[PDB]
Symmetry: C4
Subunit: 388 residues, 4 copies
């Protein structure tokens, strides 16, 4: 109809309720489920769907051998009905590639897929299910993007890309697209020293992105975008409640403008909702591996370098595998506020479970409740032994 | 369009004709059919669909081992086209959880799923395929609901929940929802001493629910709701034709306001159509197990404590497995009256058939005819030996 | 929109072109294809679909054992996209039963399914996907119907039923339905001595049905219905070109008002287009079994007792299995005339191919061309050996 | 809505970006994917889909044995969602046959399938999913057509057919259809000596077709059609950059009006975009087999007999199998020009990979970019060993 505008603020997050779970690995032990990784969720005005990067093979298929690898010519961004598994028969290919983002602007959807060899990748921006724009690698070193939904305001949908080293300074760019065309792009500015895989959400005409500093930071870089002025800033979550993985133990004081040190060249896509006292941080429980997942209410985390948790909710037990996590919201729901939501990627197989030769995942996702709901843990649920 | 109003009375029930049957277990012996239990049927203005609680695995899948269990993080309310089986590829997830209800109000559908550990469950009410409201457990003991469709009148859709013991007094509540929001809730009142899994239908602006007294009653508790005044009453079916299972042999006089004794802490979801002389009771044939199923016309069963059958129809032979049963009607059909319908859950596997390690079911459903039709029996039809 | 009216005459049939073929048995050797029999084709204003009676199991499934049987509680009328196979995932159940008919009246579709034990069957007439009317067996001996599409004119859709013996006089009735309700029914009249499985088509406000005399006739009975006056007549195709199976060798003179003798208590559903010189008869090539299939132009077959072929077209080689055949037309196509079409059921398995324990079929269908097209033969195509 | 008119010229082709890839053979190793060959892509105003000629069996199915053969009664033109594989459950049959073409005219789609024995084939032209016209073989020797999309202008959709020898002069005809009816047909004229499998596209009210001279030419014949005057011309691509396969090594001067000699009675469907300096030729890398694939910018190839490459892009490595290739464009995209696209058929199995008994393929397709994008190679990706 008309382009959606971020006119609402976030609903008060007093807890998280179960939103969607596909049990993909369990079901896929005996049905035609595609092998995936890098999933996310994204809504259209009339439906919300699960998204991910297929490996172009089923889990039980012999081609599942080797799917620990990240970039091949057999991957594609696919979407499928909420809480169903990604099957060969119900998955819709949005575009071909090994890194992606997607978002609906209120009128139609924009999907971006990057493909190519490491030194010659290119992104192709689809709008209304047609290719409209292409961008060639500018640093010749794995052009890559969000791996979760972008956000739009009045037709403008900003997207964060990075090209260059994963263990040194790289060239991050913020592109402002409208109808799949480039209106403008900026180089990254601010104090964030390295940016990868931004998780974004919007409220009151502002887009907040919690990304990852693969190079040096265990605290997360944050990019705030003004989609009207098409400008942005960057910093790190000041809080001592560190949210990357692997990471060192929590200090009593964090860092606002520098990566918090202790772990180099590694990390996991993550997210946060930064809204004053209504601030919630997600993170793996383990400081060493992609194990467990919890939400922690850390009032003023973004700006308070001594902020610590005041409430929390366990999502995945530390004795269960987690993975990537990101933000999304149904901007077309009823009500006066936007209900914060997120998904957690539950990785199964390699490298942690090497008795099988594949790597895949299932999805669990939650949204906020103004109620103080009881908690449950939500594991993948599959028995690897069955796949042997 | 406009909210549906229960303006019609029931059609005269002179017999039952076959409405739907999915043969899920038979077909699933060699195709991707999800393992389920707790099924029901529910109509939208333009389509009627089968519903159930998936176990997040196929019947042939190795994860089918253990599906006798009731509540896990891998269950979800799913719906699928009438008389098709619940397959991985055609099932639509309505919400995540292990106890549910759902109903269309004429404009859109409301679906409710409860999930959680036994002492910390919560219900989340979806409306128009979006989460709108959440309710936390109030008794910290398996918050649970209908397991069949709710009914709406002018936007108001009452739902019966129970939280607390299954073998002693519990806290039953009647919530009146409108557009997924809570308008009001009452504690249970009347003479029903224990309420679980209500089967409801509506006619002439009144909603009748035939539930189950798990604690002490072999006769069924009945809740009648006025969706305008948003008030209700409760009693038991007075008839000596006892309809729970297990149950003692039929007496010559029943009980109107107390559970009829003889069997404690057990029962099965069931239903009835209470409409004066046009009253029909469904029940298992066996007084000991979920075996067989028959419909008995028992004029004035609700209020006459000596009422006995005047006509009947066998649905499932006593040499075949049955299970849960419930009511639903197509409130959007043509004609001057609402045609009473019901489904019977045909449980296969554990605990009765333990040579297999799973528990699932298929669905058979009937609706009334003003004709006096010949009867057939409708068994699940699968041979367990094939699954060995 | 508006009820369709049979305002056109038939197009000139100079040959037959390929319309649809699903290769169900071939494909089903390694995919989830339902076991069926008694198929047909039927059009809606916007789509034409394949129809059949499922056996409630896949061909490869273990429950396929025993599917030679005709009536069980696991059968249902299903429809699926033209030329696709009937799979568990794409088949839509129209109704439950073991004998059926279906037709669109221009506004919506009416589907009829009969179910029950031999002495207590009943038909339930669905209209707009809802049950509207029920008819109880009147002769208590396998109430049965067309097994191919019915035809409508201005809302009136006549259907031919038979109840009673298959080897002696029975009670055949012609019901005239409108919106699923019974407007009127007549007993069979005319000279046809036994009627079963009528294949009908309509043109210029007249409905012609070529049925089968299971009891005594090797020539086919024909019922002509006036859907406005709601009256009909009956006779036999006068032609010496005999079209039932099994049958005796063709004589030089046929019979107009009595079954042509030689074979008792057996036959196969078949059809014809009776339109003066534009008359075409379908039949198996074999006079002994359901083997082969050919179309023969026999000018004035209905009324000329010495009519012999003037042109012909082989559809299935005598070294290939055939089965039932029936008529249908796309009454909603463009143009000035109705294009005659038909389907042939290609039966595989029992009883002819007993190395397998199942019985199923695939569908081949043709429509007429005003051109004189070259012919090909169209066999099922599956290798039974593969199923062993 | 209204018939589409070719009002735009081609966009400048500076490189090719990835458009679609289904990874059919990989995925089909463990899912219900139909065996195919002769694929193409074609757009409707609201969606673009993959097309191909099914073999009426899955790859893993036992009936896959023998699918190297070209024409059987079990083939059909099917279409399925872009970048999905052709599965038994998502494939839509357009028509029955072993040679086809299809195109949308802006209002609805026309699909043509030819079937029959070698000496008695016939084409049936479907429009709006209904059969409208039939054409009988005129040379009684494998009537055959494009094997890729046709193109329409103001309702007129020309199609090129050939009937007669594949190794000597044959009878090629250009039919001009409108709403599935024949407006006119011409015999081939011009200097092309043999025509088979034309790949066409349209721009500025002109339709260009790059076909194949199976008999003598290693350079490609080109037919240019005026869909208004319903007239055409024919010649060969003058360029020394030879594009058929097998073929002799490139000379320094090509031929404009005669087949370039060196290889007889063989070839592969291919294509080109002939637009002055904006001219790009596709071809296998190998001069001996259907191996590899590259795009070469050869300014003025059509008219310059000494034109050589000025830029290029590798699509498939010479160490990977290719096959047929053809043109298509989304005539309903936004913008001021038509974006050239093409697909390459990636053949797997027989005859090159004879350890398996089947022959199938997957699809890779690209469209042009005005950017100078980095290149990647796009192989089928399946390991034949897995199928053993
Ligand atoms: C039914 O459901 C309800 C609803 O969920 C249940 O009630 C919930 O119970 C939750 C568990 O108790 C509870 O969550 C915790 O909240 C704490 C905050 O509340 C407390 O402090 C505030 C502030 O003073 C008080 O106001 C309040 O009254 C409470 O006293 C959090 O602090 C908890 O998180 C910390 O502990 C967990 C382990 O429990 C860690 O995993 C987590 O990471 C936090 O601790 C680490 O991080 C801090 C900060 O740096 C460190 O200081 C600390 O030492 C830990 O650091 C180590 O561990 C991390 C992670 O591994 C590592 O990185 C680091 O290096 C160190 O090694 C927790 O979030 C809910 O808030 C509560 N909800 C409600 C509404 O009440 C109820 O129990 C259920 N009922 C039943 C019967 O089960
Ligand atoms: C073709 O189709 C038609 C249509 O269906 C067939 O005709 C139908 O035939 C049915 C079977 O006969 C018949 O159903 C029965 O109806 C009885 C009522 O009708 C009779 O009584 C009335 C009232 O006086 C008369 O007017 C009427 O003329 C009849 O005489 C019911 O009473 C029957 O149910 C009871 O029996 C069945 C076993 O048959 C039990 O399963 C059932 O539970 C009922 O009996 C138990 O319950 C009562 C009440 O408490 C007890 O008193 C009794 O002892 C039984 O109790 C034991 O069993 C229960 C259950 O296990 C247990 O809990 C308890 O503790 C005890 O152990 C039955 O419903 C249809 O009405 C009739 N329909 C029509 C339209 O005619 C026709 O036959 C078919 N044709 C062919 C050729 O097959
Ligand atoms: C390319 O394609 C074209 C288009 O299809 C091909 O041309 C077609 O070729 C067809 C085969 O020849 C041909 O079909 C036949 O037509 C005959 C009628 O035409 C002839 O007679 C008329 C009338 O005088 C002439 O005008 C005309 O010029 C012809 O001379 C039919 O009579 C044929 O059917 C009979 O024969 C077949 C076997 O071929 C039987 O299966 C069939 O049942 C018919 O014969 C039985 O029935 C009759 C009637 O009772 C009996 O008299 C006769 O003895 C047979 O009876 C036995 O068999 C039956 C069945 O088993 C059994 O029940 C009974 O008891 C007995 O045992 C046949 O239909 C097309 O018309 C023709 N089409 C066109 C447009 O030309 C062309 O050849 C192809 N090209 C190539 C290169 O292959
Ligand atoms: C990142 O991505 C970019 C973008 O893709 C990469 O840059 C691209 O690199 C491509 C490979 O170099 C390049 O493609 C070539 O372009 C040549 C034309 O450019 C050159 O000449 C022009 C004209 O003078 C100059 O202006 C320009 O500056 C260049 O110097 C083509 O000529 C190339 O094709 C020929 O070579 C390939 C093998 O590389 C053959 O396969 C191909 O068929 C061509 O050669 C055959 O055909 C010609 C013509 O008849 C014969 O003369 C020649 O001998 C060959 O003939 C044999 O082989 C054929 C085929 O087997 C056989 O039939 C015959 O009988 C003979 O046996 C090639 O197309 C892109 O244009 C370039 N793109 C851009 C935008 O720059 C970049 O490298 C990537 N980065 C990294 C780090 O990898
Ligand atoms: C989001 O904001 C823009 C205004 O910035 C709204 O756009 C106006 O919409 C009306 C109706 O379409 C037009 O007549 C105005 O010209 C539009 N645009 C501008 C840029 O001025 C848009 O409608 C808002 N979205 C929604 C859902 O209300
Ligand atoms: C393509 O061209 C034809 C004109 O040749 C356009 O046809 C006219 O369309 C209008 C609106 O439908 C009619 O009133 C004219 O009579 C049409 N036809 C002719 C043949 O004159 C057609 O609209 C054009 N297509 C598009 C998409 O604009
Ligand atoms: C484009 C790409 O390959 N991105 C991969 C990502 C990066 O390799 C990592 O961010 C370092 O750059 O790692 C991970 C990862 O799980 O750590 C997943 C992504 N597939
Ligand atoms: C929420 C829940 O677990 N409900 C279960 C139900 C209850 O356990 C029973 O009603 C007693 O409370 O039992 C049964 C049952 O078949 O007896 C099924 C339900 N899954
Ligand atoms: C209702 C029913 O069972 N009809 C069956 C039909 C009849 O048995 C036959 O017409 C004789 O009555 O036979 C055949 C048959 O193939 O001969 C198929 C039908 N399934
Ligand atoms: C109608 C038909 O069979 N066409 C086939 C085609 C021709 O055989 C070839 O063009 C020579 O005529 O060959 C090839 C081929 O791959 O060479 C594929 C086509 N299936
Ligand atoms: C998987 O691939 C590895 C590496 O190629 C190979 O050694 C291994 O045996 C394969 N495992 C299986 C089950 O194919
Ligand atoms: Ca399978
Ligand atoms: Ca890091
Ligand atoms: Ca009880
Ligand atoms: Ca007979
Ligand atoms: Ca050639």
């Amino acid at each position: 109809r008309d382009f959606n505008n971020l006119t609402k603020g976030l609903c008060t997050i007093n807890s998280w309720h179960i939103y969607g779970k596909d049990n993909a690995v369990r079901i896929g032990e005996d049905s035609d489920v595609l092998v995936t990784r890098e999933p996310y969720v994204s809504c259209d005005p009339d439906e919300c769907r699960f998204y991910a990067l297929s490996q172009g093979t089923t889990i039980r298929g012999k081609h599942s051998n080797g799917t620990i690898h990240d970039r091949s010519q057999y991957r594609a961004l696919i979407s499928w009905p909420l809480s169903s598994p990604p099957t060969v028969y119900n998955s819709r290919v949005e575009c071909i590639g090994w890194s992606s983002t997607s978002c609906h602007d209120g009128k139609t959807r924009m999907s971006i897929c990057i493909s190519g060899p490491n030194n010659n990748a290119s992104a192709v921006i689809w709008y209304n299910r047609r290719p409209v724009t292409e961008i060639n690698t500018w640093a010749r070193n794995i052009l890559r993007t969000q791996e979760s939904e972008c956000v739009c305001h009045n037709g403008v949908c900003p997207v964060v890309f990075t090209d260059g080293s994963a263990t040194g300074p790289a060239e991050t760019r913020i592109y402002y697209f409208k109808e799949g065309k480039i209106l403008k792009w900026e180089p990254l500015a601010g104090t964030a020293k390295h940016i990868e895989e931004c998780s974004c959400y919007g409220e009151r005409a502002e887009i907040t992105c919690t990304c990852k500093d693969n190079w040096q930071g265990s605290n997360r870089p944050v990019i705030r975008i003004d989609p009207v002025a098409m400008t942005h800033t960057s910093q790190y979550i000041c809080s001592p409640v560190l949210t990357d993985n692997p990471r060192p133990n929590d200090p009593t004081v964090g860092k606002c403008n520098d990566p918090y040190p202790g772990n180099n060249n590694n990390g996991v896509k993550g997210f946060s909702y930064l809204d004053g006292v209504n601030t919630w941080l997600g993170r793996t429980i383990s400081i060493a591996s992609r194990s467990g997942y919890e939400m922690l209410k850390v009032p003023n985390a973004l700006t308070d370098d001594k902020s610590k948790p005041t409430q929390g909710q366990t999502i995945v037990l530390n004795t269960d595998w987690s993975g990537y996590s990101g933000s999304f919201m149904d901007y077309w729901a009823e009500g006066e506020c936007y209900r914060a939501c997120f998904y957690v990627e539950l990785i199964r197989g390699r490298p942690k479970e090497d008795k099988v030769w594949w790597t895949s995942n299932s999805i669990v996702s939650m949204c906020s409740s103004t109620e103080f709901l009881g908690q449950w843990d939500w594991p993948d649920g599959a028995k690897i032994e069955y796949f042997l």
